[PDB]
Amino acid sequence: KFCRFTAEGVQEIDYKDIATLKNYITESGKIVPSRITGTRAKYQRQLARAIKRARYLSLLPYTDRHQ
Amino acid sequence: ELQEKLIAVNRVSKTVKGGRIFSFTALTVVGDGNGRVGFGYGKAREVPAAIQKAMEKARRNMINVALNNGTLQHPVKGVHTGSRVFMQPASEGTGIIAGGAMRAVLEVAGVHNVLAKAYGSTNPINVVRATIDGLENMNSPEMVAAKRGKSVEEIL
Amino acid sequence: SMQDPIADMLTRIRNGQAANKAAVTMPSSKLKVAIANVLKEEGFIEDFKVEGDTKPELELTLKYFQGKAVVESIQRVSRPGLRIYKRKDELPKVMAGLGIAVVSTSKGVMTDRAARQAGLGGEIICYVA
Amino acid sequence: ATVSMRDMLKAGVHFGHQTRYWNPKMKPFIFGARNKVHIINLEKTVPMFNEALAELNKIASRKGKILFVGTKRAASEAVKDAALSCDQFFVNHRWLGGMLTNWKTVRQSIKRLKDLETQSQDGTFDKLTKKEALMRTRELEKLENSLGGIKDMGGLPDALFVIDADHEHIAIKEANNLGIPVFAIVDTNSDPDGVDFVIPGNDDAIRAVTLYLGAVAATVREGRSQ
Amino acid sequence: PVIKVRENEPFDVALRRFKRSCEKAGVLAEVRRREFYEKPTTERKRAKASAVKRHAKKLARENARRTRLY
Amino acid sequence: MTESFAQLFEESLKEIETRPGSIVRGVVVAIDKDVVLVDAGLKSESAIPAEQFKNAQGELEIQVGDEVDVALDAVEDGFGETLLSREKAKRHE
Amino acid sequence: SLSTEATAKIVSEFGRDANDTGSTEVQVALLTAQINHLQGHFAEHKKDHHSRRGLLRMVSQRRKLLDYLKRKDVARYTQLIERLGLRR
RNA sequence: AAGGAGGUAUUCAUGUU
RNA sequence: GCGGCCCCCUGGACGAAGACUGACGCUCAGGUGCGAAAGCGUGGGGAGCAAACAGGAUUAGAUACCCUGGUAGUCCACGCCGUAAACGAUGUCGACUUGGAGGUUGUGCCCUUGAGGCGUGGCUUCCGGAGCUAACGCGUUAAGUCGACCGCCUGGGGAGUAC
Ligand SMILES: [Mg+2]
Ligand SMILES: [Mg+2]
Ligand SMILES: [Mg+2]
Ligand SMILES: [Mg+2]
Ligand SMILES: [Mg+2]
Ligand SMILES: [Mg+2]
Ligand SMILES: [Mg+2]
Ligand SMILES: [Mg+2]
Ligand SMILES: [Mg+2]
Ligand SMILES: [Mg+2]
Ligand SMILES: [Mg+2]
Ligand SMILES: [Mg+2]
């Protein structure tokens, strides 16, 4: 599966990059499991935080149906 | 020349679909009265068949004990499952002052003088195993000196 | 906390013999070296040495005769929680004399046999068989 | 007769199993690890092999029966050829639990095989129906695969040469029970406790087993020449 | 799971896509889990039991490849 | 004098290369119906399925002594048997 | 906790060079500063039992250090508990 | 709901979709 | 026991290299503090859920299970309470004794050739060897081998009850 953050040296995932985060949410808008994406556990936690911060700022939708 | 002794015969049961199947177990000890002793445990549907199986099994799987003039070399301790067994060399004339199973095994192994005392479960099967284990884990001055690289007089 | 370095040294010997190690090592002290010398002269260990200037390490090379370890049992007798002293008449006989009782007399640490001949009592460090 | 490091190394005796399967008791004979595979220290193999050869020679000179035990697919035919060509006995199919410790019952089966075999030569399997000539023939085939190498042994052997101490643990244990020394080629994943003459080395390559067997067969042959 | 009807796509084909989309979002499993309250102890017990048996079956399988059944 | 196993193995190791993914010369030791036993100088003689050699023409184009080339999978694989493969070497070149 | 600059000042005051951080006087002084600081926190946060457990460790450690110092050199101990304004 | 296949499961360009 | 995100105040753990103090340690009766849920007091708040309760069914009966409601309570603030299968049914501290597969969090090195290779720490799950275990098991995170100190046990019921 191979983590795409360990191989890029990324320190913090960043919630302002709405291209990487879109790859890590599903169509409904929920966060995809690390078991599927092959992300490491450390970057998974960072990634989940970034997605939640983006949702608050309405860069990402919470769900597919409130819009 | 091997003296033999049956210590215990005990009826067990299996409780098959039709009812209870009773069979017999025999505990025996054989020894040459000069430092070799073995025990045998045999099961069968009849008492003679059981004792026979036990005697044959006991004649095999015998071991050798380093006996000192009909007495022990030094105080020994034997332990098997829930049976502890203390044995001590005594002076000629005392006799074999031992318990129930220990009496048979010591008599047949050629110990004529000993002070023995069983601590713990006095189940004959485990008692026999513990006393034989104690007699086997007992060393003489010759082997102790050889192990330590000394002479017997050096060890005294 | 470590509160009985003598028992620790006996424990290392016991565990090393049970695990068939060639030699065991421990931090050194003069009491440990004295006990080690008695063991070596009684033939329970093959050799000992001390290496190190500021933090000496005492190394003992263990002995096996027929595959089996030479020291059959070794137990601390006097311990910090309960000290044992014996008068010259009351010295023990480990294994009817076939073992040694390391006794720390006023003339140094020696075996029970040596102290009994020298007419001394003292503290009983350990039993060795 | 005599082997050397180059011959052992050409046949692949130094190779062992992979590290995660080893036996800590087998550590002394381990040289190193290369690409997650243990390497067997031939400096230990050579003197041990020569010492085992000397003991095997002494037994052969005293007219001791040698039982060649090897049952893996990589050493079945190898062990059969070595024991035929050294005038000794072998087992190269599934070892029967109790071959040695239950020799009395196993011996009755030996007698059955001999009678069945002589009957086949005589022609007894003609009077009976065709089915009774295939059943008995099938019985003879099975008895040959199992006890065809020890039908003439006639007693408990004096030594076992087991190719795989791991695979043939039952045979080694019966030997230890009875009193029979064991000479065993022991890999890195095996237990050398029940073996009396350990010979570290790869036991899965056909080249290596042929190496060991040729040397052992020559030693026994020369010891019986005497 | 919001499925838009594609061009020329028959109804059966679109319906299969929609059913699989819902099964991928796991809606029905979620609803069945929220029908009734379960104590946190019950939830933890069930989670731990599934892990234990899943691990045991993986280990059992990975050892079944070792031996032959005939 | 003896070239101790250290130096001897130090030569051998660079003489036969054990990389999980490198093709090596392999001599067929035995032809069999559905399997082919090759030896590359390793822990064991691999049993390759024969259909990599009974070619698309249905011809067992090789026999004993043919220095074929095969892909090394593992010098030991679970059961002490080196794993080789011919169509892998085929596909690489 | 205690800032980098605050620790540096205290080490200079109570240690006999900038590199003397392990002295009993310096350790007691650092512990005392942090203990005094946390009083305001626990005045506003009476329900912070977890942080208060950390504080009790500090108080306990200061007593052990002062006991050692009193038994080891009484004059330094009197001088220290006078500067730091500590009873007993 | 029933069966089959693959795994302890994915790398499998993106794009298209 | 702790689960959205953000801020403020704050506790502990670990790693790297180095400097400093110089036995300052371990355990701990009594004592002190923390301590699920239910409950209690005072005042809030009350969507959902829900003892008690009310009704409807089921049943030979049904003071239950099932259904429709529904109060205290569950939430907050401040005080009580001090207890649980508060369990790893395994007291704390230290030392020693074969291995394997993982997780998680640091760090060093090598060619990072591209998620690689090679080491070294902390915590953690599962197998397991010797040894221990009535046995089950346990096993370097012991229930092996040892030492320090504290807590407890002495047939079952009466009874964790009476006074
Ligand atoms: Mg009793
Ligand atoms: Mg108390
Ligand atoms: Mg409450
Ligand atoms: Mg209230
Ligand atoms: Mg109220
Ligand atoms: Mg209701
Ligand atoms: Mg209680
Ligand atoms: Mg709990
Ligand atoms: Mg629990
Ligand atoms: Mg309790
Ligand atoms: Mg286990
Ligand atoms: Mg009461």
TrEMBL record, chain B:
<keyword id="KW-0694">RNA-binding</keyword>
<protein>
    <recommendedName>
        <fullName>Small ribosomal subunit protein uS5</fullName>
    </recommendedName>
</protein>
<dbReference type="InterPro" id="IPR000851">
    <property type="entry name" value="Ribosomal_uS5"/>
</dbReference>
<dbReference type="InterPro" id="IPR005324">
    <property type="entry name" value="Ribosomal_uS5_C"/>
</dbReference>
<keyword id="KW-0699">rRNA-binding</keyword>
<dbReference type="GO" id="GO:0003735">
    <property type="term" value="F:structural constituent of ribosome"/>
</dbReference>
<dbReference type="GO" id="GO:0000028">
    <property type="term" value="P:ribosomal small subunit assembly"/>
</dbReference>
<dbReference type="InterPro" id="IPR018192">
    <property type="entry name" value="Ribosomal_uS5_N_CS"/>
</dbReference>
<comment type="subunit">
    <text>Part of the 30S ribosomal subunit. Contacts proteins S4 and S8.</text>
</comment>
<dbReference type="GO" id="GO:0006412">
    <property type="term" value="P:translation"/>
</dbReference>
<keyword id="KW-0687">Ribonucleoprotein</keyword>
<dbReference type="InterPro" id="IPR005712">
    <property type="entry name" value="Ribosomal_uS5_bac-type"/>
</dbReference>
<comment type="function">
    <text>With S4 and S12 plays an important role in translational accuracy.</text>
</comment>
<dbReference type="GO" id="GO:0019843">
    <property type="term" value="F:rRNA binding"/>
</dbReference>
<dbReference type="GO" id="GO:0022627">
    <property type="term" value="C:cytosolic small ribosomal subunit"/>
</dbReference>
<comment type="similarity">
    <text>Belongs to the universal ribosomal protein uS5 family.</text>
</comment>
<comment type="function">
    <text>Located at the back of the 30S subunit body where it stabilizes the conformation of the head with respect to the body.</text>
</comment>
<dbReference type="InterPro" id="IPR013810">
    <property type="entry name" value="Ribosomal_uS5_N"/>
</dbReference>
<dbReference type="InterPro" id="IPR020568">
    <property type="entry name" value="Ribosomal_Su5_D2-typ_SF"/>
</dbReference>
<dbReference type="Pfam" id="PF00333">
    <property type="entry name" value="Ribosomal_S5"/>
</dbReference>
<dbReference type="InterPro" id="IPR014721">
    <property type="entry name" value="Ribsml_uS5_D2-typ_fold_subgr"/>
</dbReference>
<feature type="domain" description="S5 DRBM">
    <location>
        <begin position="2"/>
        <end position="65"/>
    </location>
</feature>
<keyword id="KW-0689">Ribosomal protein</keyword>
<dbReference type="Pfam" id="PF03719">
    <property type="entry name" value="Ribosomal_S5_C"/>
</dbReference>
